[PDB]
Amino acid sequence: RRGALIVLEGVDRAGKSTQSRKLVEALCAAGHRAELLRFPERSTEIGKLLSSYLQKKSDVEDHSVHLLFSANRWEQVPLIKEKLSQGVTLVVDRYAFSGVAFTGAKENFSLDWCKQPDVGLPKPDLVLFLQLQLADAAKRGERYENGAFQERALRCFHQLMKDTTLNWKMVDASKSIEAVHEDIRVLSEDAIATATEKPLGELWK
Amino acid sequence: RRGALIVLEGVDRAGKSTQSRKLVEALCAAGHRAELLRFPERSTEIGKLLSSYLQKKSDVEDHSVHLLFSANRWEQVPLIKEKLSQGVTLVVDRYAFSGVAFTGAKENFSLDWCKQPDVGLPKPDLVLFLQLQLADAAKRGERYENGAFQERALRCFHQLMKDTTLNWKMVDASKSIEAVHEDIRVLSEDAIATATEKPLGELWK
Numbered sequence: 273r274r275g276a277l278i279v280l281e282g283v284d285r286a287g288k289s290t291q292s293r294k295l296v297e298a299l300c301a302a303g304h305r306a307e308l309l310r311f312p313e314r315s316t317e318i319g320k321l322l323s324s325y326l327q328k329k330s331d332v333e334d335h336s337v338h339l340l341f342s343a344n345r346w347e348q349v350p351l352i353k354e355k356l357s358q359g360v361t362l363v364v365d366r367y368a369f370s371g372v373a374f375t376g377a378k379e380n381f382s383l384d385w386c387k388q389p390d391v392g393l394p395k396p397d398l399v400l401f402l403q404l405q406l407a408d409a410a411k412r413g414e415r416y417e418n419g420a421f422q423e424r425a426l427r428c429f430h431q432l433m434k435d436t437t438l439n440w441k442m443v444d445a446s447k448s449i450e451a452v453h454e455d456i457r458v459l460s461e462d463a464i465a466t467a468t469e470k471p472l473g474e475l476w477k
Numbered sequence: 478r479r480g481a482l483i484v485l486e487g488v489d490r491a492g493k494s495t496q497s498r499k500l501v502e503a504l505c506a507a508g509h510r511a512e513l514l515r516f517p518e519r520s521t522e523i524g525k526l527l528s529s530y531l532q533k534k535s536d537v538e539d540h541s542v543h544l545l546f547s548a549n550r551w552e553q554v555p556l557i558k559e560k561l562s563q564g565v566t567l568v569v570d571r572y573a574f575s576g577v578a579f580t581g582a583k584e585n586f587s588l589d590w591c592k593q594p595d596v597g598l599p600k601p602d603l604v605l606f607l608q609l610q611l612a613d614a615a616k617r618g619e620r621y622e623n624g625a626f627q628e629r630a631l632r633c634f635h636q637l638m639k640d641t642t643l644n645w646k647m648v649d650a651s652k653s654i655e656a657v658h659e660d661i662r663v664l665s666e667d668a669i670a671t672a673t674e675k676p677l678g679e680l681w682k
């Protein structure tokens with residue numbers, strides 16, 4: 273039986289990294305083979321250019337930066353497919369959705385253009401959206417770290433959620449770390465148990 | 478008056494670099510402000526990864542490599558737009574067409590997916606296609622340097638030429654360097670003189 277591809281999305285400070293780490297821990301403690309992945313994955317050459325960019329150490333033309341973020345996902349596709357075929361469930365901290373939402377929050381970027389590079393990536397079996405008021409997210413904890421930009425990103429995320437081809441689940445990320453974790457864990461157990469019967473799909477196609 | 482954006486395309490060994498160099502020389506000698514550009518532009522960080530890839534010094538997942546080639550064009554867009562607005566005609570040795578044709582020659586790559594990343598780039602005013610039999614190209618002068626792959630690339634180029642939104646001009650590249658140059662020079666003079674009256678367009682949109 274293949275593993276499940278579970279993605280956590282949300283604006284900055286929504287609790288994605290905290291919940292992805294806790295989810296992998298709990299699934300492993302309950303006997304599942306599960307591993308954490310994140311995007312961008314900064315250990316690669318592409319990821320290094322992305323990190324310099326996000327730290328404002330370098331400036332990059334907006335379309336180039338968008339394409340590098342997508343290429344950074346494609347470079348991990350062979351690994352993603354191999355792990356899933358091996359029975360390993362992958363918990364992914366940000367994915368193509370963040371890619372479209374953050375670039376789509378910029379001027380003169382259509383959602384259609386932003387989606388294309390990621391068309392065909394492994395399709396998540398479950399996309400958890402950690403919902404919380406922007407003002408709350410701002411009380412917790414770089415480029416894109418301002419309220420007006422987060423608000424436009426959030427709107428883009430809501431457009432992507434109209435996409436019925438995907439198993440979106442809303443999570444109330446305003447609760448305690450432990451309460452949000454239990455909600456996420458129960459949804460993830462269900463997806464691992466029931467969403468893996470069908471072959472891995474292809475995103476946005 | 479803005480400069481013209483002229484692109485030279487063709488399979489490997491078609492004479493693109495020789496003709497692009499000669500064209501810029503002749504236009505400048507005839508009083509035009511013209512400069513040469515090429516893709517990939519290996520002087521950048523992205524271009525360096527592309528060069529390692531083409532030299533087989535590194536392996537790269539096919540979708541990532543496709544997106545890096547496109548990002549390498551977008552990183553030069555601000556410069557392209559500035560030069561053209563300044564009256565400078567740009568002669569470009571390979572462009573988005575090569576990008577689509579070479580990736581589209583690989584298995585499981587649709588032309589549509591291959592075009593998307595380059596949608597919206599500056600639209601060439603003239604696209605010269607240096608036509609010559611593959612067997613001839615092979616008598617002149619790396620990754621992709623085998624006949625079966627060049628033949629699939631060539632077929633992709635012929636699909637792109639169905640695109641009526643673009644000013645494609647076929648050149649008989651089997652003639653002498655000087656004869657091919659004169660054909661190219663005359664077409665280029667016409668485009669500089671007549672194709673620049675309208676604003677710079679956007680590719681594939």
Ligand SMILES: Nc1ncnc2c1ncn2[C@@H]1O[C@H](COP(=O)(O)OP(=O)(O)O)[C@@H](O)[C@H]1O
Pocket residue numbers: 282283284285286287288289290291412413445446447448449452
């Ligand atoms: N449910 C929560 N309640 C309060 N603070 C939280 C909660 N989840 C995470 N945090 C804190 O908010 C900050 C951002 O969390 P993090 O998981 O890194 O978010 P993200 O990856 O979405 O930016 C961290 O300091 C974290 O401890």
Ligand SMILES: Nc1ncnc2c1ncn2[C@@H]1O[C@H](COP(=O)(O)OP(=O)(O)O)[C@@H](O)[C@H]1O
Pocket residue numbers: 487488489490491492493494495496617618650651652653654657
């Ligand atoms: N018209 C031509 N006839 C014969 N050889 C040519 C002609 N044009 C170019 N060549 C030679 O073919 C080789 C490849 O030319 P080049 O301009 O670098 O092609 P490309 O950039 O399309 O690969 C070079 O050695 C060049 O001198």
Ligand SMILES: Cc1cn([C@H]2C[C@H](O)[C@@H](COP(=O)(O)OP(=O)(O)O)O2)c(=O)[nH]c1=O
Pocket residue numbers: 284311312326327341342366367368370371372374375414415416
């Ligand atoms: C995956 C992904 C993220 N992003 C954004 C979301 C974040 O704001 C940012 C990286 O923020 P940064 O603060 O540098 O890192 P981290 O959140 O790990 O501490 O990248 C994109 O713009 N495109 C993408 O494809």
Ligand SMILES: Cc1cn([C@H]2C[C@H](O)[C@@H](COP(=O)(O)OP(=O)(O)O)O2)c(=O)[nH]c1=O
Pocket residue numbers: 489516517531532546547571572573575576577579580619620621
């Ligand atoms: C511009 C571009 C070229 N190409 C290919 C065409 C050439 O085969 C190759 C670079 O070949 P290489 O032999 O490394 O360089 P050059 O032709 O300058 O000596 O890149 C792509 O695959 N995608 C692209 O977007």
Ligand SMILES: [Mg+2]
Pocket residue numbers: 288289290
């Ligand atoms: Mg995080």
Ligand SMILES: [Mg+2]
Pocket residue numbers: none
């Ligand atoms: Mg489309």
Ligand SMILES: [Mg+2]
Pocket residue numbers: 493494495
């Ligand atoms: Mg050349």
